[PDB]
Short mmCIF file of N, CA and C in Angstrom, two decimals:
data_model
loop_
_atom_site.label_atom_id
_atom_site.label_comp_id
_atom_site.label_asym_id
_atom_site.label_seq_id
_atom_site.Cartn_x
_atom_site.Cartn_y
_atom_site.Cartn_z
N UNK A 294 139.08 75.40 118.49
CA UNK A 294 139.38 75.91 117.71
C UNK A 294 138.95 75.12 115.78
N UNK A 295 137.87 76.42 114.94
CA UNK A 295 137.08 75.43 113.51
C UNK A 295 137.19 76.92 112.74
N UNK A 296 137.44 76.80 111.59
CA UNK A 296 137.25 77.25 110.14
C UNK A 296 135.83 77.51 110.70
N UNK A 297 135.49 78.67 109.34
CA UNK A 297 134.43 79.03 108.84
C UNK A 297 133.21 79.19 110.60
N UNK A 298 133.71 79.50 111.33
CA UNK A 298 133.00 79.83 112.60
C UNK A 298 132.33 80.99 112.57
N UNK A 299 130.88 80.91 112.37
CA UNK A 299 130.15 82.66 112.26
C UNK A 299 129.90 83.22 113.76
N UNK A 300 130.05 84.13 114.19
CA UNK A 300 130.33 84.86 115.60
C UNK A 300 128.39 85.44 116.15
N UNK A 301 127.45 84.58 116.71
CA UNK A 301 126.43 86.02 116.32
C UNK A 301 125.88 86.22 117.56
N UNK A 302 126.20 85.73 118.53
CA UNK A 302 125.97 86.50 119.81
C UNK A 302 125.71 87.81 120.29
N UNK A 303 124.41 88.18 120.89
CA UNK A 303 124.19 89.78 121.18
C UNK A 303 123.69 89.77 120.33
N UNK A 304 123.53 89.07 118.30
CA UNK A 304 122.69 90.38 117.51
C UNK A 304 121.09 89.79 117.57
N UNK A 305 119.95 90.64 117.28
CA UNK A 305 118.78 90.89 117.14
C UNK A 305 119.10 90.09 116.14
N UNK A 306 117.18 88.78 116.08
CA UNK A 306 117.19 87.80 115.53
C UNK A 306 117.44 88.71 114.16
N UNK A 307 117.27 89.91 113.81
CA UNK A 307 116.86 89.75 111.76
C UNK A 307 118.53 89.80 111.64
N UNK A 308 119.64 90.55 112.26
CA UNK A 308 120.73 91.12 112.16
C UNK A 308 121.62 89.28 112.34
N UNK A 309 121.27 88.34 112.82
CA UNK A 309 121.74 87.37 112.67
C UNK A 309 121.21 86.54 111.53
N UNK A 310 120.45 86.48 110.89
CA UNK A 310 119.73 86.26 109.98
C UNK A 310 120.06 86.50 108.64
N UNK A 311 120.25 87.85 108.72
CA UNK A 311 121.06 89.44 107.48
C UNK A 311 122.65 88.01 107.33
N UNK A 312 123.58 88.26 108.80
CA UNK A 312 124.96 87.80 108.48
C UNK A 312 124.70 86.76 108.03
N UNK A 313 123.83 85.71 108.42
CA UNK A 313 124.10 84.25 108.19
C UNK A 313 123.85 84.09 106.64
N UNK A 314 123.08 84.90 106.39
CA UNK A 314 121.79 84.48 105.01
C UNK A 314 123.55 84.89 103.46
N UNK A 315 124.04 86.31 104.95
CA UNK A 315 125.37 86.49 104.34
C UNK A 315 126.48 85.84 103.43
N UNK A 316 126.58 84.67 105.25
CA UNK A 316 127.44 84.46 104.53
C UNK A 316 127.50 82.61 104.16
N UNK A 317 126.01 82.13 103.77
CA UNK A 317 126.21 81.22 103.20
C UNK A 317 126.72 81.40 101.62
N UNK A 318 125.97 82.35 101.39
CA UNK A 318 126.21 82.62 99.63
C UNK A 318 126.94 82.33 99.87
N UNK A 319 128.30 82.93 100.37
CA UNK A 319 129.88 83.61 100.01
C UNK A 319 129.91 81.62 100.20
N UNK A 320 129.59 80.70 101.26
CA UNK A 320 130.44 79.24 101.45
C UNK A 320 129.68 79.31 100.30
N UNK A 321 128.81 79.77 99.91
CA UNK A 321 128.22 78.57 98.39
C UNK A 321 129.09 78.54 96.91
N UNK A 322 130.01 80.23 96.83
CA UNK A 322 130.37 80.37 95.98
C UNK A 322 132.32 80.21 95.61
N UNK A 323 132.85 79.92 97.72
CA UNK A 323 133.30 79.62 98.00
C UNK A 323 134.28 77.92 97.84
N UNK A 324 132.64 77.26 98.03
CA UNK A 324 132.55 76.23 97.73
C UNK A 324 133.39 75.61 98.98
N UNK A 325 132.86 76.19 99.91
CA UNK A 325 133.13 76.34 101.78
C UNK A 325 132.31 75.39 102.50
N UNK A 326 132.34 74.78 103.07
CA UNK A 326 131.55 74.26 103.60
C UNK A 326 132.84 72.05 105.52
N UNK A 327 131.94 72.75 105.85
CA UNK A 327 130.26 73.12 106.83
C UNK A 327 130.68 74.72 107.38
N UNK A 328 129.92 75.25 107.83
CA UNK A 328 129.63 76.51 109.00
C UNK A 328 129.43 75.94 110.27
N UNK A 329 130.25 76.47 110.54
CA UNK A 329 129.71 76.74 112.39
C UNK A 329 128.89 78.08 112.74
N UNK A 330 127.60 77.72 113.12
CA UNK A 330 126.87 78.89 112.99
C UNK A 330 127.09 79.42 115.25
N UNK A 331 127.93 80.53 114.88
CA UNK A 331 127.61 80.28 117.32
C UNK A 331 127.38 81.29 118.14
N UNK A 332 125.22 80.57 117.83
CA UNK A 332 124.50 81.83 118.24
C UNK A 332 124.97 81.64 119.56
N UNK A 333 124.79 80.43 120.65
CA UNK A 333 125.44 80.81 121.57
C UNK A 333 123.56 80.40 121.83
N UNK A 334 123.47 79.71 123.73
CA UNK A 334 122.39 78.76 123.60
C UNK A 334 121.14 79.84 124.70
N UNK A 335 121.53 80.30 125.35
CA UNK A 335 120.59 81.29 126.06
C UNK A 335 119.05 80.65 126.21
N UNK A 336 118.29 81.83 125.61
CA UNK A 336 116.49 81.22 125.84
C UNK A 336 116.29 80.41 124.20
N UNK A 337 117.21 80.32 123.79
CA UNK A 337 117.07 79.44 122.80
C UNK A 337 116.43 79.93 121.21
N UNK A 338 116.41 81.74 122.14
CA UNK A 338 115.85 82.09 121.10
C UNK A 338 116.46 82.62 119.51
N UNK A 339 118.08 83.31 119.51
CA UNK A 339 118.65 82.88 118.08
C UNK A 339 118.63 80.81 117.47
N UNK A 340 119.09 79.93 117.47
CA UNK A 340 118.96 78.83 117.74
C UNK A 340 117.55 77.94 116.95
N UNK A 341 116.51 78.47 117.50
CA UNK A 341 115.14 78.67 116.95
C UNK A 341 114.56 79.85 115.32
N UNK A 342 115.29 80.93 115.54
CA UNK A 342 115.01 81.72 114.38
C UNK A 342 116.14 81.70 113.53
N UNK A 343 116.77 81.33 114.08
CA UNK A 343 117.98 81.22 112.38
C UNK A 343 117.89 79.48 111.97
N UNK A 344 117.16 78.58 112.45
CA UNK A 344 116.75 77.42 111.87
C UNK A 344 115.81 77.42 111.23
N UNK A 345 114.74 78.08 112.00
CA UNK A 345 113.49 78.28 110.92
C UNK A 345 114.17 79.37 109.64
N UNK A 346 114.72 80.24 109.57
CA UNK A 346 115.45 80.77 107.98
C UNK A 346 116.44 79.55 107.21
N UNK A 347 116.44 78.82 108.03
CA UNK A 347 118.22 77.33 107.52
C UNK A 347 117.06 76.84 106.15
N UNK A 348 115.61 76.59 106.49
CA UNK A 348 114.70 75.92 106.51
C UNK A 348 114.15 76.53 104.78
N UNK A 349 114.69 77.10 104.89
CA UNK A 349 114.62 78.30 103.22
C UNK A 349 115.15 79.06 102.32
N UNK A 350 116.22 78.34 102.80
CA UNK A 350 117.45 78.96 102.55
C UNK A 350 118.00 77.91 101.28
N UNK A 351 117.85 77.90 99.73
CA UNK A 351 118.13 77.03 99.04
C UNK A 351 119.99 76.70 98.70
N UNK A 352 120.79 77.03 99.22
CA UNK A 352 122.25 77.08 99.57
C UNK A 352 123.00 75.84 100.57
N UNK A 353 121.50 75.41 101.44
CA UNK A 353 121.86 74.66 102.44
C UNK A 353 121.33 72.91 102.41
N UNK A 354 122.82 72.76 102.31
CA UNK A 354 122.16 70.77 101.83
C UNK A 354 120.74 70.33 103.35
N UNK A 355 121.80 70.59 104.55
CA UNK A 355 121.45 70.25 105.90
C UNK A 355 122.26 71.25 107.11
N UNK A 356 121.19 71.42 108.30
CA UNK A 356 121.73 71.78 109.00
C UNK A 356 121.02 70.92 111.10
N UNK A 357 122.13 71.04 111.48
CA UNK A 357 122.11 70.90 112.95
C UNK A 357 122.57 70.86 113.66
N UNK A 358 121.95 70.56 115.38
CA UNK A 358 123.10 70.99 116.18
C UNK A 358 124.66 70.46 116.14
N UNK A 359 125.61 70.73 116.76
CA UNK A 359 127.15 70.69 116.59
C UNK A 359 127.16 69.60 117.72
N UNK A 360 127.96 69.12 117.91
CA UNK A 360 128.04 67.52 118.90
C UNK A 360 128.15 68.17 120.40
N UNK A 361 127.79 67.35 120.95
CA UNK A 361 127.93 68.17 122.78
C UNK A 361 129.17 69.29 123.36
N UNK A 362 130.74 68.27 122.35
CA UNK A 362 131.33 68.60 123.16
C UNK A 362 132.01 69.37 122.10
N UNK A 363 130.96 70.10 121.02
CA UNK A 363 131.81 71.23 120.20
C UNK A 363 131.26 72.09 120.08
N UNK A 364 129.96 72.77 121.59
CA UNK A 364 129.11 73.30 121.48
C UNK A 364 127.53 72.81 121.23
N UNK A 365 127.58 71.98 121.10
CA UNK A 365 126.05 71.39 121.05
C UNK A 365 124.79 72.51 120.71
N UNK A 366 124.05 72.42 121.97
CA UNK A 366 122.79 72.59 120.91
C UNK A 366 123.14 74.61 120.98
N UNK A 367 124.13 75.55 121.63
CA UNK A 367 125.01 76.37 120.68
C UNK A 367 124.73 77.60 119.83
N UNK A 368 125.49 76.08 119.18
CA UNK A 368 125.86 75.78 117.81
C UNK A 368 125.34 75.09 116.57
N UNK A 369 125.05 75.76 115.30
CA UNK A 369 124.28 75.35 113.96
C UNK A 369 125.35 75.11 113.34
N UNK A 370 125.36 73.88 112.87
CA UNK A 370 126.46 73.59 111.89
C UNK A 370 125.10 73.41 110.25
N UNK A 371 125.79 74.39 109.24
CA UNK A 371 125.21 74.35 108.33
C UNK A 371 126.45 73.32 107.04
N UNK A 372 125.49 72.47 106.62
CA UNK A 372 126.22 72.02 105.66
C UNK A 372 125.63 72.75 104.27
N UNK A 373 126.96 73.14 103.39
CA UNK A 373 126.24 73.97 102.49
C UNK A 373 127.01 73.74 101.37
N UNK A 374 125.53 73.47 100.48
CA UNK A 374 125.60 72.86 98.86
C UNK A 374 127.02 73.22 97.50
N UNK A 375 127.23 72.00 97.26
CA UNK A 375 128.29 71.91 96.43
C UNK A 375 127.63 72.42 94.89
#
């Protein structure tokens, strides 16, 4: 269990991206980081599309897969700017 987990499994890419964009903006405002985006592994559709979005989000310092024991490539860690 972690704080700041975003549960995105079962969403469309468009809905997932919108939830993530909002969550990041909220986190920057509240000075919260890191975020754990739990999109699941699956076919990698949500991880790849979310990452493509993350490149473009000005609130994000960096992002990467979680460690293998903390969800691995089924979770994207988002480090939010201060």
